[PDB]
C-alpha cells in the first residue's frame, strides 16, 4: 500500500537542503541526506550529511533546516503496481 503525501515522515535516505550558514555567514542550502532520526521532547533530530565537495562531515540538524519542499525520497525497489490476487 502507498498513497500521495507531502513530507509524510522523514525517513533515512531522504535528500533535502539542510540550511547551513557557512563562515561568511550566508544561509546556505546544501544537499544533505538523512541518516538517522530522533526525538527529544518534540525536538526531532536528523543526522544529515552534506553532499557537495567534502571528505566527511555528518552532523545532526533540525526540521527547520529540513526543506521537505525540496526533499527527494529514495527510489527503493521499482515503482510499479501488480494485480493483487487473494486478499
Swiss-Prot record:
Subcellular compartments: Nucleus; Chromosome; Cytoplasm; Chromosome, Centromere, Kinetochore
Residue stretches in coiled coil: none
The record places domain Tudor-knot at 11-68
Instruction: Give the N6-acetyllysine positions (modified residues).
Output: 55
Q: Which residues form the signal peptide?
A: none
Please report the PTM annotation for this entry: The phosphorylated form has a higher activity. Phosphorylation by VRK1 following DNA damage promotes KAT5 association with chromatin and histone acetyltransferase activity.
Instruction: Give the record's subunit note.
Output: Component of the NuA4 histone acetyltransferase complex which contains the catalytic subunit KAT5/TIP60 and the subunits EP400, TRRAP/PAF400, BRD8/SMAP, EPC1, DMAP1/DNMAP1, RUVBL1/TIP49, RUVBL2, ING3, actin, ACTL6A/BAF53A, MORF4L1/MRG15, MORF4L2/MRGX, MRGBP, YEATS4/GAS41, VPS72/YL1 and MEAF6. KAT5/TIP60, EPC1, and ING3 together constitute a minimal HAT complex termed Piccolo NuA4. The NuA4 complex interacts with MYC. Interacts with ATM. Interacts with JADE1. Interacts with PLA2G4A/CPLA2, EDNRA and HDAC7. Interacts with the cytoplasmic tail of APP and APBB1/FE65. (Microbial infection) Interacts with HIV-1 TAT.
Provide the family line: Belongs to the MYST (SAS/MOZ) family.
What is the disorder linked to it? Neurodevelopmental disorder with dysmorphic facies, sleep disturbance, and brain abnormalities: A neurodevelopmental disorder characterized by severe global developmental delay, intellectual disability, poor or absent language, behavioral abnormalities, severe sleep disturbance, seizures, cerebral malformations, and craniofacial dysmorphism. Progressive cerebellar atrophy is also observed. Additional features may include genitourinary tract anomalies, hearing loss, and mild distal skeletal defects.
Q: What does this protein do?
A: Catalytic subunit of the NuA4 histone acetyltransferase complex, a multiprotein complex involved in transcriptional activation of select genes principally by acetylation of nucleosomal histones H2A and H4. Histone acetylation alters nucleosome-DNA interactions and promotes interaction of the modified histones with other proteins which positively regulate transcription. (Microbial infection) Catalyzes the acetylation of flavivirus NS3 protein to modulate their RNA-binding and -unwinding activities leading to facilitate viral replication.
- UniProt protein name: Histone acetyltransferase KAT5
Amino acid at each position: 500500500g502507498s498513497s500521495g503525501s507531502s513530507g509524510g515522515e522523514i525517513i533515512e535516505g531522504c535528500r533535502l537542503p539542510v540550511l547551513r550558514r557557512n563562515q561568511d555567514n550566508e544561509d546556505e542550502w546544501p544537499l544533505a541526506e538523512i541518516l538517522s532520526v530522533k526525538d527529544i521532547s518534540g525536538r526531532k533530530l536528523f543526522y544529515v550529511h552534506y553532499i557537495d565537495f567534502n571528505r566527511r562531515l555528518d552532523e545532526w540538524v533540525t526540521h527547520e533546516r529540513l526543506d521537505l519542499k525540496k526533499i527527494q525520497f529514495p527510489k527503493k525497489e521499482a515503482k510499479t503496481p501488480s494485480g493483487p490476487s487473494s486478499g
